[PDB]
């Protein structure tokens, strides 16, 4: 094959060209995103029940929906929350690989059939079935700076004039409004209501009658009277369109003939659909849009398109309106791409410098310069064909493959140059002989490397999905690299390399290079002399090897694992938790204090604070809030002190002061769904109808026991909410019946006034919007207010609520959880330092075995996978190990010689562990994929050394030692050349600071440390491996 192309350089150029064209096309059409999809598909059902408490939501909506989630394919598990904001969310999570669209339609279809079982007011609000995602492309904030607009005014503006244009913008998959379009707000006054013997029931009835669409018919409709000249539609009552019209709604006509209008018993205005969130941006009222990338789209294009759309909306903004960008992943992503291109180009330049330094001609220096880009371009082509995107993972997959690609180029060319200098063979014949020496090995190498990387594509769940990205990228690159080495590089060598006279090693050259040559020729002799002595003393080096292996084991066990390193992404979060029952106003004071700190004591670093009062992650309610902090650009934040981790620590430090509120700051995770390594996610389950209180006691029992094992378990805690005081009111049925008051009137009077009620729709400047009735605030604040609400009896008398009700305080849950259709309580925690999560989990199970009868448990999320897609790592490395051995055995036609290559594995691993341990790093994916490439490269070096030695023995009848000495003599230069280039090339990643430096450091340090020891150790150990293995067998 290489011989084929050596006589057909043009056919080889053709192949190269087709690959470059395919690659260029792919690079133009490839999707770009920070991360590919990784979490298993999940569908969320969401419902609102205005005015409802958690138990009401759970028992009339949640249980009913859950009981209908049958006959849906590939469900792993289901969980739900029902809470006192009147909200339910049920999340159904599917097997990896499930078609998300099919999953969603199957859920939505089962829901559709359950809708008639749900309360009217819930059927009326509607129940959303959506695909779950947690990643936004960007968040566009919309603020008013001149004090003329409330957040509700802004949200409506955004909904009416911005959202839809954004949704239609190229590459946008979904857009979420932070707030609602206006609702017609009717704020009732119980004092007026009673003044005229009216109730919210009459208000509701009047609005339904006087704000409505009424069908009529046609004039001259078919079938007509013949001779009819005209056919026209008849238009009757249509919906109201203004606050004025609603104010004029007629409620009652008094005898004196006076008219009671709705405006006489209520305040009427356009307002929000709800009032649980208060959003501020640097203390200014705010709304916004959360935007998500559409499947297969290009993040950078889409971001630019969104801004182009926003720009052309500006001219029409009302005074004071301004767009802000608190969150945008696009700038971070641009840097990653630039940093990666920079790395690949410098690598090619380093290879250029090293080739020239050692080979001292520009023709040799040209060959890798051509071959490597061809391999890269082709890798893009194969990735595009596999449906991959350009993302953080696939991009580092490529830089992790740099050593391997650079090496293939260097190996082929260096070997031809050596053959010419050693035999004065003309370039074409030299190239034939040279490829003859290495081609078998290059093929064997391609098999071995596949055996090393492919198995990584077979892990399960989320981690598997991450590994898959590196696996296929590296394997594709590696395969293309071998193909180019067998096809293109040999033809280039045969046509571009100039002859070298037999014996000329440039030692007679003048100036710096003659010196380098002399210097290096004799360093090679010292090298061989040294291997010579080593090979008279193999015993002690076996001892040094076992010491290396042991230190590796040691270092490895103590190197903490993680997933992906944190980044200064230019933003971070701060949580605000006030005591249960705290009011919205109290939370607001803390947020204000938080905001004040950031804009004051971090003014140099902080661009903005987006304070969301009323929003939580593990709970909503007036006592929870979040402060989303956006930072100035990295360039204006020089120094470790002005970076997210530091700012975060200072922030939390400062907020530990804050009285009755838990307040703290934290950086964002690279990917929310992975949680933490060490982290587990546990569900306690009511298996026997025990009820909420007994489940709570069981939970506490388990939490107290966990706390007795600080050595194994840390921060073992409830993910949900504690019970709180609630106001129980009993209607007396007998008294209501005696007074002639209906329960319907009593119950809608209470609910409408105190909880609010969605009556129907109206049309606001062309857009359909909701009408809500509720009491004006001051009449639904305290228990004493209850008795100021009157209900009309059958005889027309007005009856105060106090006459037919009684009340008392009690405790209840503001948030009820279920897991797989049973009452549950989620418990989070992590393994203690030096402990595996498996160990932590084993204990949790032990502790759980001792809980009251009828209490069970399960593992969910990351722990669910662990308990599964984490029992594969040793079966996969075993296959890998066996396949590698088998390939080697076929390469060398021996069952023993393969051992001399495989012994090389620890040599690179020890250096990677040393560097990571010393730099204070962790055993993460970048580290791990790097071990594989580092191992891959050293294996390749050993394979060629052994191949040469063995061939010298088989073919030239040479002694074991003689052959080993000569082989290692010939392999030294190309091995050093590659290491120098690759080591220098990864150094920028090692020392890098700033954006993306987390990932860069993780890839670079392990690689540089592994390459150092692999290079230095292998050139002394593989000759030992070979000699000892041969002697033994």
């Amino acid at each position: 094959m290489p011989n084929f192309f050596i006589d057909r350089p043009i056919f080889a150029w053709v192949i190269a060209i087709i690959i470059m064209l395919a690659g260029g096309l792919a690079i133009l059409k490839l999707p770009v995103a920070q991360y590919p999809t990784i979490a298993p598909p999940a569908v969320t059902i969401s419902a609102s029940y205005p005015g409802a408490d958690a138990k009401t939501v759970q028992d009339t909506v949640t249980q009913v929906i859950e009981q209908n989630m049958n006959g849906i394919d590939n469900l792993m598990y289901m969980s739900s929350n029902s809470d006192s904001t009147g909200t339910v969310q049920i999340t159904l999570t599917f097997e990896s690989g499930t078609d998300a669209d099919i999953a969603q339609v199957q859920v939505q279809n089962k829901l559709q059939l359950a809708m008639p079982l749900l309360p009217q007011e819930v059927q009326q609000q509607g129940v959303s079935v959506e695909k779950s995602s947690s990643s936004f492309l960007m968040v566009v904030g919309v603020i008013n700076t001149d004090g003329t607009m409330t957040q509700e005014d802004i949200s409506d503006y955004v909904a009416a004039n911005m959202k839809d244009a954004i949704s239609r913008t190229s590459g946008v998959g979904d857009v979420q409004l932070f707030g609602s379009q206006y609702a017609m707000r009717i704020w009732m006054n119980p004092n007026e209501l009673n003044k005229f013997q009216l109730t919210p029931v009459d208000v509701i009835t009047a609005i339904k009658a006087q704000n409505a669409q009424v069908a009529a018919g046609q004039l001259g409709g078919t079938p007509p009277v013949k001779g009819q000249q005209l056919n026209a539609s008849i238009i009757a009552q249509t919906r109201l369109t203004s606050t004025e019209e609603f104010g004029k709604i007629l409620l009652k006509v008094n005898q004196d003939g006076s008219r009671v209008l709705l405006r006489d018993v209520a305040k009427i205005e356009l307002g929000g659909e709800n009032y649980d969130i208060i959003a501020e941006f640097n203390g200014q009222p705010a709304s916004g849009l959360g935007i998500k990338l559409a499947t297969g789209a290009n993040a950078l294009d889409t971001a630019a398109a969104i801004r182009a759309e926003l720009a052309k909306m500006e001219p029409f903004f009302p005074s004071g309106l301004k767009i802000v960008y608190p969150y945008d992943t696009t700038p971070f992503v641009k840097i990653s791409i630039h940093e990666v291109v920079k790395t690949l180009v410098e690598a090619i330049i380093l290879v250029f410098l090293v080739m020239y330094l050692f080979l001292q001609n520009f023709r040799a220096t040209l060959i890798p310069t051509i071959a490597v880009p061809v391999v890269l371009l082709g890798t893009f082509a194969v990735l595009a064909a596999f449906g991959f995107s350009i993302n953080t993972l696939t991009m580092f997959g490529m830089v992790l493959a740099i050593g391997l690609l650079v090496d293939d180029a260097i190996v082929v060319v260096e070997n031809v140059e050596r053959v010419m200098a050693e035999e004065g063979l003309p370039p074409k014949e030299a190239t034939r002989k040279s490829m003859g020496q290495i081609q078998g090995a290059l093929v064997g190498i391609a098999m071995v490397l596949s055996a090393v990387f492919v198995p990584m594509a077979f892990f399960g769940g989320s981690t598997g999905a991450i590994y898959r990205q590196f696996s296929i990228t590296i394997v594709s690159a590696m395969a293309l690299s071998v193909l180019v080495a067998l096809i293109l590089t040999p033809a280039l060598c045969a046509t571009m390399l100039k002859p070298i006279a037999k014996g000329d090693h440039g030692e007679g050259k003048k100036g710096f290079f003659g010196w380098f040559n002399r210097m290096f020729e004799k360093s090679t002799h010292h090298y061989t002399d040294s291997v010579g002595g080593i090979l008279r003393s193999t015993g002690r080096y076996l001892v040094l090897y076992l010491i290396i292996v042991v230190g590796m084991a040691y270092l490895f066990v103590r190197l903490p694992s993680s997933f992906l390193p944190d980044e200064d992404q230019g933003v971070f979060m701060t949580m605000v938790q006030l005591p249960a029952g705290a009011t919205q106003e109290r939370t607001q004071k803390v947020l204000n204090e938080v905001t004040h700190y950031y804009l004051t004591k971090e003014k140099n670093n902080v661009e903005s604070v987006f304070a969301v009062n009323g929003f939580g992650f593990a709970g909503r309610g007036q006592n929870t809030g979040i402060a989303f902090v956006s930072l100035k650009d990295w360039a204006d934040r020089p120094g470790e002190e002005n970076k997210v981790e530091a700012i975060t620590m200072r922030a939390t430090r400062a907020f530990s002061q804050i009285k009755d509120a838990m307040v703290f700051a934290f950086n964002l995770p690279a990917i929310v769904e992975l949680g933490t390594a060490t982290g587990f996610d546990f569900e306690l389950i009511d298996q026997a109808g025990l009820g909420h209180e007994k489940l709570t006691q069981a939970r506490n029992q388990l939490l107290a026991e966990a706390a007795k094992h600080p050595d194994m378990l840390t921060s073992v805690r409830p993910n949900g909410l504690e019970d709180t005081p609630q106001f129980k009111i009993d209607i007396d049925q007998e008294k209501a019946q005696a007074l002639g008051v209906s329960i319907n009137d009593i119950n809608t009077t209470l609910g409408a006034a105190w909880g609010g009620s969605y009556v129907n729709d109206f049309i606001d400047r062309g857009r359909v919007k909701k009408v809500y009735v509720m009491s004006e605030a001051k009449y639904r604040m305290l228990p004493d207010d209850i008795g100021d609400w009157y209900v009309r009896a059958a005889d027309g008398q007005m009856v105060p609520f106090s006459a037919f009700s009684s009340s008392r305080w009690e405790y209840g849950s503001p948030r009820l959880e279920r897991y797989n259709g049973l009452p549950s309580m989620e418990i989070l925690g992590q393994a203690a330092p030096g402990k595996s999560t498996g160990e932590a989990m084993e204990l949790m199970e032990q502790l759980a075995s001792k809980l009251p009868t009828g209490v069970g448990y399960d593992w969910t999320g990351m722990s669910y996978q662990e308990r599964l897609s984490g029992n594969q790592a040793p079966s996969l490395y075993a296959i890998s190990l066996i396949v590698v051995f088998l390939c080697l055995a076929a390469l060398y036609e021996s069952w023993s010689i393969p051992f001399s290559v495989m012994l090389v594995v620890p040599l690179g691993v020890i250096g990677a562990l040393l560097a990571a341990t010393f730099r204070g790093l962790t055993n993460d994916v970048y580290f791990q994929v790097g071990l594989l490439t580092t191992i891959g490269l050293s294996a390749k070096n050993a394979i060629l050394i052994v191949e040469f030695a063995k061939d010298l023995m088989d073919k030239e009848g040479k002694g074991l030692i003689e052959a080993t000495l000569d082989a290692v003599r010939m392999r030294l230069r190309p091995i050093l050349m590659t290491s120098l280039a690759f080591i220098l090339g990864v150094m920028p990643l090692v020392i890098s600071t700033g954006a993306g430096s987390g990932a860069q450091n993780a890839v670079g340090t392990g690689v540089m440390g592994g390459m150092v020891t692999a290079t230095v150790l292998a050139i002394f150990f593989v000759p030992v491996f070979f000699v000892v293995v041969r002697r033994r067998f």
Partner: protein, 156 residues
């Protein structure tokens, strides 16, 4: 209402006896009340923490503290079936006939929930069998409406 007041409310509700002990040593306000007017004694009575109830009463807790709707710790203990707490409270001066704002008494509540033993203890301590809530109901009315034949006998 103080650092220690708050912690005492929490500890009493959670039934953390050791914490309460330490808080008593440090002067934590036994009369701390939350928004709805519940004292640590209310909390302990509701959640059935007997030892904490006794510790609180030894440390000058108001056995007849009432909440914002006029309910006492005895109301809670009697309603939720905490027999021995009920006995302790009454030993310590609890008003057996306290009426909340609805005119409801501990007897009404024990009756309503069919807590026979508690009903008998209450009567023992002078519970007024003829007391009427805002609706004119007695514990006997409650028992026949519930169809609790036994309790109705006890209340002849």
């Amino acid at each position: 209402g103080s650092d220690l007041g708050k912690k005492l409310l929490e500890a009493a509700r959670a039934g953390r006896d050791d914490e309460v002990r330490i808080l008593m040593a440090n002067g934590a306000d036994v009369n701390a009340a939350d928004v709805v007017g519940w004292t640590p004694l209310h909390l302990a009575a509701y959640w059935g923490h007997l030892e904490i109830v006794e510790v609180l009463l030894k440390n000058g807790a108001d056995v007849n503290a009432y909440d914002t709707l006029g309910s006492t710790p005895l109301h809670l203990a009697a309603h939720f079936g905490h027999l021995e707490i009920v006995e302790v409270l009454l030993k310590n001066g609890a008003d057996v006939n306290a009426k909340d704002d609805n005119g409801i008494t501990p007897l009404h509540l024990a009756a309503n929930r069919g807590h026979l033993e508690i009903v008998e203890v209450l009567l023992k301590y002078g519970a007024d069998v003829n007391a009427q809530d805002k609706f004119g109901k007695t514990a006997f009315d409650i028992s026949i409406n519930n169809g609790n034949e036994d309790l109705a006998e006890i209340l002849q």
